[model samples]
Target: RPADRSKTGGWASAAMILCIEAVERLTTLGIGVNLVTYLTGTMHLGNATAANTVTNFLGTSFMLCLLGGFIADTFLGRYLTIAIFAAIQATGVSILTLSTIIPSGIQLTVLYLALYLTALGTGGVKASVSGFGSDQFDETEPKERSKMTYFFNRFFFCINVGSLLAVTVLVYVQDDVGRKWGYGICAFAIVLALSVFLAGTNRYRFKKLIGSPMTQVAAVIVAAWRNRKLETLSTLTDVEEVKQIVRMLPIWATCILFWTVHAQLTTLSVAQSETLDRSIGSFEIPPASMAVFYVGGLLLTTAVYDRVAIRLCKKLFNYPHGLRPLQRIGLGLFFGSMAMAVAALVELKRLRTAHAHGFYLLIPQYLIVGIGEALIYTGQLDFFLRECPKGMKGMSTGLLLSTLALGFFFSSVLVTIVEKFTGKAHPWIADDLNKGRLYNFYWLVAVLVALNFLIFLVFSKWYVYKEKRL
Candidate 1:
């Protein structure tokens, strides 16, 4: 099938891409949200070890986005890269499903192997898909440009939708039915997602690969370094691009802490919830299902922000665009810090309760963090798409993801450091949630995020905004 060059992509293309996103996210997040519980309950790992392993796995998965970006930008186009990696993901998922069927002796090794494989495949999809979809819009056309913004918002909204399903539906299946059935659903969903993606081939807007984007990135760095002493450079525009990258670095650095806090939902939050009473009426809620509230908050907020809030802001603030990217990001950080603070209080309350408290007690912190994510995460996507050079959008998104990966990695490091410094006698984070002082750890995270937010404020204030090109 050939694309009709006369017709610019519209709802058809966007819908198909969003469908792919929904399916992929449902599968990946289904595994991720419940992974710590799986390790602790099924694999029988201790809490601290399980948390670290989940963080490390997540970090590695996201870090590999760079590799995916390189492949997409340097050689294969986004479409092919996404196709190949999706197939790879299905295979990995298949292996994981097999792990559930096989003997318990080798299950750990197979599970780890499957996780890394899925991570590699997911990295490729993450690097390419959003950038590819963004490529569909013609920035020169006003309607298309507006739609581009909507597209990012909808993309995030779809992610939350998938996440909601994972936590509610899939986690239920895992907790009540079996891991095999849950993973089986994941494998099927991914394959279906890939098929849906391919079915839209003719309607898709595919960008041509500019030769080796990594080479271009390296050239910019070298040019900037070599021309350091000169008042002006041979290519002033290239120098300006380098300057933009420089400006984005501090913002990027501060966001790492934001993600580190976000990572807790998957690892520590799930662990903490397990100790609480998960009963909801006649049915008991799965610990992983507790994340549904978080994802639900994000979905609701994103929809409201896109449809109502932005319009209201435009009218009230008298600004053409509702909020600047940095403003949106900062708002998210503020909420993120507040969420952690709330989390600390929640933990303290949990600790004080001799009997197990209802798991729903975690809802406030989850909602706050999800709202924060809806703002900052979507803001970052918009920022990268607008700020990066047209040819390097894929890599720019990859870099954003890399920061998230590093955040998860650094979270693991932070945990290790805290444990090392606290000593064994009175450990802040022991394997048992009841035995350890998790409230102290949550408070520490809140303080660190507050500091990070202040640092982001300074950098964002000084930062020059990227001009929208026609």
Candidate 2:
């Protein structure tokens, strides 16, 4: 009786969820935007300690997505999981705010506890939010299906928009005012977001939880292993679901390189901007604001892609849907390669000019990568949501998030390998850009991405789209 509805979902559910996303991202980014600064400035931590702390926290948070998704899919369902975790996050935010006022001796411990708590909530929310939102639409209806895809694009766009605002406004609060005030604001923001989400409880089309999906996944694996000697595959319907995951692995593998290069935007790119003039006329720009170029590019490009590009593609390609998910994701890989090339060229110019140019020259590279981000990230979401087996929607989304997580970890591995192997030779990257060949590193990444793009093309060509059997 509760599931009954004459018109289940339209603008009402979409608007409500979008609002939740906006506020949630706003709070998340507000806390994250200036965290390194807080650790360094307020807590008096060393550079290495602060950076490592942030990195480890983010990595763990992303990895927890798998656990959260499993719980949601198997036991609690999306709505209940989100509600429970949102409350947990609110508690974490409250603790974080308290950390600002506490004594230094106990502050760090409290801060870390709060950080992990928020990570738990972030994992739960990220795993279920998009899937839950899409649940409102009846996928059998063409218009609803189209709307769901559009919602994915809008979801990503809202993330960037919230991030942009946080970096600009909330960062100023944290830097200029007190850290306590900033964290307090973030706590309040999350509270508001949760309240808004709860307000829409009646309108959302909730999904029923299946018991222990991991058991089913494990069973499939065990059955396949035992049947390995057989000439033909098992006839179980779930076996087909297992095969879809295997088929998608290559596509996922190709994307790791793309994210590995993208990871540099915050690390190496920030360092590169430090050496260049950040002054715009008489006003000096904060080096951190350099991130705006990338976020802005992503936001603007997504808006255009959702609006103008779709129409243009429909007219030009004669397909109602502008591009298939694979094509869209492939284009993103190509652009990612181009972005790395641009970065290499920018570094080369910076070296030749001896850092004479302003940091604005790096804008093109970030902008290009942002466009790639828009295509690939959202395309991946759409692909996973639409093509994954019905029982594994949350798990599939978690898997996509895991890829990005692994990509960040892999970037660190790549750097270590390069540094170790090239220790005797002229090092590819050094503290001093002028002293070391930073351009060479960027060019190397560009080549890797180009090769990855080629591999992606082959995989995309061979890939067959899967539909859930009812």
Candidate 3:
């Protein structure tokens, strides 16, 4: 017999997922908010080391989600995947808490292992959670269709909430109590939230996971010669899914620059925060808390810009439904470029200040980066979700996450190139970081952003949006 269709928990799944999202965001941000600064200052890693490690970890975290999503679809189901992730993450945080007790020589290795374990669970669950939640809504109904989109916006909002809390609370914990305990608290928070997820699972209505055509792409590549039909440009329907996967390559290739700039949060940005004067007339802000501005700006601007863009499209252009998804995304790319420009200017200002006195001019630059994030990332999420093929919902989410991984992979390559070419620092800019090699880095980012913006503009204009119509 079909399962009971009149369950109250199923009816209320939307709100429940929102609450869960809020908690997940808190856990994610609690750890990430100060990740870079903690590594640089407390762990005593160099800027390059901190940046590269964090970005590499971030890339691996995203890529591993593909395996998690596969497991969720094949064996575990969404609920089990989430639970497993929460548990593993909880253990990882606990290990982080033990840093003080471990020998200093082995502390870094232990922390890396712990962080990777957490990523295993986190990566798996994050890939599936949103699509799983959306499954509860019946798209046949207009109300449910509206709920689907609302779910996306709300999910974004909830993440920002956790991030904001992390900036305010966790940053303080890292500064006042000690970094190890602060990490431990993050572990505890993940455990508590994960337990709540399990307690509420009975209320969730999970759809059976579905398969995608892309699943067969691997086998096709392996057996092309055996089939005696290895044509490069086959018919659209008859064409290999491998070719479609190849299409993802061009877009993925460009994201390297984005990830490189993104890595600044752990490297240059954090270091700048440390050297910069953080005292605002005796209120002496911790360097980690500078993330509060970034977190806060992303939260507030996402809300404001989404509305503003929607309104302007309806009023100014007479397009009642707002700009097409790709246009909004292209505009976001432009905004991201602008944000990079702002960061570059901020770096220049800091360089001048460093020459004259000590470093106190970086606060405004951080604020600018925060604003840029609000515009670019929010739009990218909207674009990724909208652009994906249906049925492969969770896989599509994993694909979006993969873009970030690609970005980081590219960033790693870039860093290696810069290290090879420029020696310790770019000779054109200041030779020393203490003096100001950072501005040169920001300038490099600014140029890359300009290139990305140009490429995105063309791509967005030509991009076709394809989906199955119900």
Candidate 4:
């Protein structure tokens, strides 16, 4: 189990880590991928209410990444953190499985507790796994450095692999086996991941945690506020400690706006899909299963992006050498904005059809959004990883996901504000009675998306790629 201590051998470490990474993604995403449908159809909540609940759940899950990293770095270490979290996740799923066998009302309290625990556990893995994977790479050699980056890309690929499987199989289970079965599948996934991670534990080099960056970062802010010299510290090459955090703000702000629209996929879009015509033959396609289509598109594009796209860029555009991470991410965000625009159109059509045509006419729009997501969402992983500080890679990735949570939070807040404007009379989505407001709400997101795109264009120019040290 000893590491080869060579860069080329880092591939083995990467492969193992990728499995853990993929399963982690698959379980989280597969559940979330279908969450909207589950919330609305199975739980039978209204759009606004469902959106608010789901966003709170997701946003909190994302925000917990900070805690996850803290635990891994300071106390538990990555292996233990991962194992502990996986166990918690499995327990949560088991609880959900038990709940499914009982009446819904009896299980509500347990279900929420299990879900929160599962989310908390999931945050640990999402926050710290990448840096943990990188630790497997022997960075002392040049070949190792090359392979480490190679491993990094493969890590993204592995994430999609789990995602790809979840889209089809998990959705099928959610529909065919029902809620208990879906939770069971997640339980099995955690078991497999725990076993895989532990099998290779002795091979990894564990780093000692000095302290948390949060306290240190806060202290620097206080110091800078008091001293003019500290303000100029970012300009000094010797003062990289001060400069790094400052530079992160602009890049961070730019992406938060993008995520605001991105989070709507689970909330607004899924709700809209339910109201549309989803019939294909005798089967009314589950709105959640529709997201699997985006995963499908991602699988296809990942191939082109990995193989043909990189070579073509170099030869045709004389685009430097390797495909830059931000470049790929920039290309991806275009699809995200476009996806929202497309969703806007779909919402308008669904609004009219619910009256003029019918409630089941929005499947095409869901499919379109799915394809657009393929082009957009996957790129964020590459973008954030490439840009984060070497020592703080875990935190950087957490920040990316946190933006997603923030987006969902803001969306919920926006919905509340709008409904308040409407006098909060009878609740915005009173059991399919007031679905009309959702269409108007989506239009609000589209206008914001357009504005964000222009902001992204301006901010992207100042975006700097973090230098890969190992």
In model 3, state the lDDT of residue 15.
54
Q: Can you write out model 3's per-residue Cα lDDT over 222-243, one digit (the tens) per residue?
A: 5677778756444353343345
**Model 2, range 111-133, lDDT digits (tens) per residue?**
89999888888877766776677
Best by TM-score: 1
Model 2 weakest lDDT span, ten residues long? 461-470
Compared with the true structure, what per-residue lDDT tens digits does model 4 show for residues 143-170?
6667667667766666666676787678
Best by lDDT: 1
Local accuracy of candidate 1 as per-residue lDDT tens digits, 1-470: 34546374566677666665566678777888888888898888877778888888889878887788778877858888888988988899889888878664677888999998988888888777766766655547757667768777767755766677778999989888999999998898878888888888877777666644457568877766777889555266765665555556788778788788788877888888888887778978788887888887777896777677667776778454577567788988898888878888887776777436467678888889888988888778777676667755545665677788898998889888987888577687777777777788888889999999888887776675433331
Question: Looking at model 1, which ten-residue stretch has the lowest summed lDDT?
Answer: 461-470
Q: Report model 2's TM-score to 2 decimal places.
A: 0.77
Error of 1 at 207 (Å): 4.6
After superposition, which runs of candidate 4 have C-alpha atoms over 4 Å from their true positions?
1-19, 104-106, 133-135, 139-159, 199-204, 209-215, 224-241, 282-284, 307-334, 357-395, 423-430, 433-435, 458-470
Residue 255 displacement (Å), model 3: 4.2
Q: What do the candidate models score in CA lDDT, each in turn?
A: 0.78, 0.72, 0.63, 0.64
lDDT of 3: 0.63
Shift of residue 183 alpha carbon in model 1, Å: 0.6
- Give each model a TM-score: 0.85, 0.77, 0.83, 0.79
Worst 10 residues of 3 by lDDT: 424-433
